[PDB]
Amino acid sequence: ENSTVGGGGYNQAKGRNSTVAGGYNNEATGTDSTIAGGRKNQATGKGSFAAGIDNKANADNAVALGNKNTIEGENSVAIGSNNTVKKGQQNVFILGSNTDTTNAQNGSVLLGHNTAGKAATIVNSAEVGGLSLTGFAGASNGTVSVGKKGKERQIVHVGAGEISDTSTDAVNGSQLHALATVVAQNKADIKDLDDEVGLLGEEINKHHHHH
Amino acid sequence: YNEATIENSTVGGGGYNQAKGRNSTVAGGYNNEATGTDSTIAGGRKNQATGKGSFAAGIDNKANADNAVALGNKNTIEGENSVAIGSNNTVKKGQQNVFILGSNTDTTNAQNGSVLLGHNTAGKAATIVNSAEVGGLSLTGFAGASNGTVSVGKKGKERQIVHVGAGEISDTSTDAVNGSQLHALATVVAQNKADIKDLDDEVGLLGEEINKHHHHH
Amino acid sequence: ENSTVGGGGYNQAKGRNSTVAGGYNNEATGTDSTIAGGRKNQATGKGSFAAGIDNKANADNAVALGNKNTIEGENSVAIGSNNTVKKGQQNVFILGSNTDTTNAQNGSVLLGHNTAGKAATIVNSAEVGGLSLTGFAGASNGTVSVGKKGKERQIVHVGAGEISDTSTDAVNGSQLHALATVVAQNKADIKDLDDEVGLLGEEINKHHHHH
Ligand SMILES: [Cl-]
Ligand code: NI
């Protein structure tokens, strides 16, 4: 039914308006589904698209491009190799390989090789050894992951973020450095003052002797 | 009802597909129109590809500027050298070099060179941040100020960035900072604050001693 | 050998199960390789995929989509224009244009126009004018790059990161602002104390001349 194969062997365009352009053992089952080519691909979702080896573009609007990208949650994308989005993980976006989406919530983005999804936390405040930090902006959706535990990735060439009480811009090392220079100066001032207080203490104690 | 007259144009199969551009390809689907030189529609339904060397697949995409890539559902690209992959994304004419991997984004305020990642993500204009005033405290000499932005969410719907490596901490560093680096600096600040209190106690007791001495006169 | 062209001119589907759906001067040489269309594309890798103008999807599972994306390292992806991954850079993901992968290591991710790759550094500690900061989390492959030197990009709409001794969450401007408010307050407290110590010194010095 306005379906097209294409060329190759054992290819099936079973979906209405579906297309398999070629390759081997490609099955496009969804309405408006597409397999550009490769081998052992499926595309069961409406308007889905797969190319490469052993992908499953198996939910509506799924994009699965490369090797062994499985998509079974709506409006999701996986490009690269060995990635899986499972049914009821919606709007998940992977550009990466050998990822882990066990903990990826809806809306989450995974970037890079060996990258893991992680559940969003709500961080409005923080307590650091008896000091309270309060009033954090942007305590919301999923997360954006750039690596996994034990295999973290630096983010580089990051522009200086707005530094203010509502800012939700990322901060770079120079901004931390700049605040730390003041902290280091405060700590030296405290020492200078301490020396002064000690000397003042000695003079008082000196004074009563030979009064 | 297919249409492939021009040099090296190909349809493909399906219905109401048109490969009007020189070397253009529509591999199949329904109501796909590839109009640009070297344009390509892999399949799906209601796709356009008016740009040179453009590529669309899925439902209702417009890969309508040079080298546009529009892949999924309802990706409209009308700005040169731009990409949208996912769902309901738009790059307008005069937004160049913009890259979206996401859905239901907002590129109203996105400038040239922006990257949008994720669902409900909004574009934002770059600001120049060379310094900052916190209370009466001045912070200066920030790196990576005076290109577009990289957005990970929208106002009210921000996203944590996780598994970030410790960034270099130096006066020229443009590396992102992670929570353990702010924690480390905060431990020292907390220690300064306690030291201040200890010292304040000591000054008060020294004060009393001075006052007591006058009443030994 | 289950190969398919497609339409167009000077297209070649030389690989087993390879597909060129159309276009001009496309050569698909790898097993299970695919060229969706365009002009002057190559796909020498197994299960590779190219579309657009002048791409090389020339390593296993390569995805090269747009204009002048060259992939010659395994399991890599480039989408956009003018991007290159050389033989011996594996698992590199580019969504961007006019990038520089000279210094990109394996596993690294490049985002956006004019973006440069950068070697990972190990940052366990830092020394800021006589102050030591230690105990950093997330220190030991590749980096995630958002710009180049001189063309840094701000990251925006970042959620508040966890603030703890092990956190590898990114930090936003409001979190730095929150810490800086306390630093500013420490600094004023130091001034107030300094004034007090000065006055106490005057009392001591005056007293001796009431003797
Ligand atoms: Cl401080
Ligand atoms: Ni006396």
Taking the CA of residue C47 and the nearest CA in chain B, the distance in Å comes to: 17
Query: With the CA atoms of A42, A48, A52 and A56 taken in that order, what torsion angle do they form, in degrees rounded to the nearest 10?
Result: -40
Ligand number nearest CA of A203 is: 2
Same domain, A137 and A185: no
Can you give the CATH number for the domain in which C113 is found?
A: 2.150.10.10
Same domain, C121 and C108: yes
CB B26 within 8 A of CB B19: yes
CB contact B109 to A (< 8 Å): no
DSSP SS3 for B141: coil
Same domain, B157 and B172: no
CB A64 within 8 A of CB A75: no
**Burial (CB count <10 Å: 0-12, 13-18, 19+), residue A30:** buried
Place of tokens 């399906």: B14
Same domain, A31 and A80: yes
Task: Give the nearest chain A residue to B197 (CA atoms).
Answer: A190
CB contact A95 to C (< 8 Å): yes
How many Cβ atoms are within 10 Å of A206's Cβ, its own excluded? 10
What tokens does B67 get? 């080298």
Please name the member of C47, C51, C154 whose beta carbon is closest to the beta carbon of A39.
Answer: C47
Taking the CA of residue C74 and the nearest CA in chain B, the distance in Å comes to: 22
CB contact under 8 A, C128 and A177: yes
How many Cβ atoms are within 10 Å of B22's Cβ, its own excluded? 16
Q: Which domain holds residue A196?
A: 160-211
Which among C58, C100, C89, C65 has a CA at the least distance from the CA of C79?
C65
CB contact C178 to B (< 8 Å): no
CB C28 within 8 A of CB C19: yes
Beta strand pairing status for A56-57 and B55-59?
unpaired
Task: Give the nearest chain A residue to C116 (CA atoms).
Answer: A157
Q: How many CB pairs under 8 A join A and B?
A: 341
Residue C119 CA to residue C141 CA, distance in Å, equals 9
Taking the CA of residue A28 and the nearest CA in chain C, the distance in Å comes to: 16
CB contact C180 to A (< 8 Å): yes
Residue B180 CA to residue C133 CA, distance in Å, equals 10
Same domain, B59 and B78: yes
CB B100 within 8 A of CB B116: yes
Ligand number nearest CA of C185 is: 1
DSSP SS3 for A207: helix
Q: How many CB pairs under 8 A join A and C?
A: 330
CB contact A182 to C (< 8 Å): yes
The type of residue at B41 is I
Please name the member of B38, B129, B162 whose beta carbon is closest to the beta carbon of C38.
Answer: B38
| B181 CA from centroid of ligand 1 (Å) | 15
Which among C80, C75, C79 has a CA at the least distance from the CA of C92?
C75
Residue C87 CA to residue A200 CA, distance in Å, equals 71
The type of residue at C51 is A
Ligand number nearest CA of A190 is: 1
Residue C142 CA to residue A102 CA, distance in Å, equals 23
CB contact under 8 A, A49 and B71: yes
End of a domain among C137, C159, C181? C159
| B205 CA from centroid of ligand 2 (Å) | 17
CB contact C161 to A (< 8 Å): yes
**Resolution as reported, in Å:** 2.2
CB A146 within 8 A of CB A115: yes
List of chains touching A (3+ CB pairs within 8 A): B, C
End of a domain among B122, B137, B165? B165
The type of residue at B26 is V
CB contact B161 to A (< 8 Å): yes
Same domain, B100 and B110: yes
Same domain, A155 and A176: no
Residues 6+ away with beta carbon under 8 Å from C182? A131, A133, B189, B193
What tokens does A60 get? 């509506």
Taking the CA of residue B70 and the nearest CA in chain C, the distance in Å comes to: 10
Taking the CA of residue A117 and the nearest CA in chain B, the distance in Å comes to: 9
Please name the member of C33, C144, C193 whose beta carbon is closest to the beta carbon of A111.
Answer: C144
Residue B19 CA to residue C36 CA, distance in Å, equals 14
Same domain, A142 and A171: no
Task: Count the domains in chain A.
Answer: 2
Taking the CA of residue C87 and the nearest CA in chain B, the distance in Å comes to: 25
Residue C19 CA to residue A25 CA, distance in Å, equals 13
Task: Give the nearest chain A residue to B126 (CA atoms).
Answer: A159
Please state at what angle helix A173-208 crosses helix C173-208, rounded to 10 degrees.
Answer: 20
Q: Read off φ and ψ for residue A158, nearest 5 degrees.
A: -85, 120
First vs last Cα of chain A: how many Å apart? 112
Residues 6+ away with beta carbon under 8 Å from A121? B160, C162, C169
Per CB-CB distance under 8 Å, the chain C contacts of A77 are: none
Same domain, B196 and B120: no
DSSP SS3 for B199: helix
| B86 CA from centroid of ligand 1 (Å) | 46
CB contact B123 to A (< 8 Å): no
SS3 content of chain C, % helix, strand, coil (to 5): 15, 35, 50
Buried b (16+ CB within 10 A) or exposed e, C54-87: bbbbbbbbbbbbbbbbbbbbbbbbbbbbbbbbee
Task: Give the nearest chain C residue to A7 (CA atoms).
Answer: C4
Can you give the CATH number for the domain in which C165 is found?
A: 1.20.5.170
Residue B181 CA to residue C125 CA, distance in Å, equals 9
DSSP SS3 for A190: helix
End of a domain among A159, A176, A193? A159
Same domain, B156 and B203: no
CB contact C23 to A (< 8 Å): no
Strand runs (DSSP E) across chain A, as ranges? 4-5, 12-13, 19-20, 27-28, 34-39, 42-43, 49-53, 56-57, 63-71, 77-85, 93-97, 109-113, 126-128, 131-133, 144-145, 155-156
Instruction: Give the max Cα distance, chain A.
Output: 113
Please name the member of C36, C140, C178 whose beta carbon is closest to the beta carbon of A135.
Answer: C178
Residue A3 CA to residue C7 CA, distance in Å, equals 18
| A180 CA from centroid of ligand 1 (Å) | 8
Same domain, C152 and C183: no
Residue B52 CA to residue B61 CA, distance in Å, equals 15
Place of tokens 């400038």: B111
Which among C53, B17, B42 has a CA at the least distance from the CA of A38?
B42
Which among C103, A144, A174 has a CA at the least distance from the CA of B175?
A174
For chain B, give the number of residues: 217
Please name the member of A95, A160, A173 whose beta carbon is closest to the beta carbon of B170.
Answer: A173
Q: With helix as H, strand as E and coil as C, how does A104-133 read?
A: CCCCCEEEEECCECCCCCCCCCEEECCEEE
The type of residue at A148 is K
CB C76 within 8 A of CB C64: no
Per CB-CB distance under 8 Å, the chain C contacts of A184 are: 128-131
Query: What Rg, from alpha-carbon coordinates, does chain C have?
Result: 29
Same domain, A37 and A129: yes
CB B96 within 8 A of CB B80: yes
